[PDB]
Amino acid sequence: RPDFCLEPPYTGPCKARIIRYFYNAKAGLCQTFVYGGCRAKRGNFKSAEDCMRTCG
């Protein structure tokens, strides 16, 4: 599990409301967050599956 998996999700400064996934280490599963559309961090996934495969 890369360290980026444990960094908090980042919405960023753009104004869209795109649902993305992040790994919640406490819960042990990937959950959703609202992404603004630009300046994403590494722990920003397009599906629960991509998220679980990388961070799970």
From Swiss-Prot:
Disulphide bridges, residue numbers: C5-C55, C14-C38, C30-C51
Gene Ontology molecular functions: calcium ion binding; molecular function inhibitor activity; potassium channel inhibitor activity; protease binding; serine-type endopeptidase inhibitor activity; sulfate binding; zymogen binding
Organism: Bos taurus (Bovine)
All residue ranges annotated as the BPTI/Kunitz inhibitor domain in the record: 5-55
Record site: Reactive bond for trypsin: K15, A16
GO cellular component, one term: serine protease inhibitor complex
Protein name: Pancreatic trypsin inhibitor
Function comment: Inhibits trypsin, kallikrein, chymotrypsin, and plasmin.
Gene Ontology biological process: negative regulation of platelet aggregation; negative regulation of serine-type endopeptidase activity; negative regulation of thrombin-activated receptor signaling pathway; trypsinogen activation
Mitochondrion among keywords: no
Source organism, top-level taxon: Eukaryota
Cellular localisation: Secreted
Keywords: Disulfide bond, Pharmaceutical, Protease inhibitor, Secreted, Serine protease inhibitor, Signal
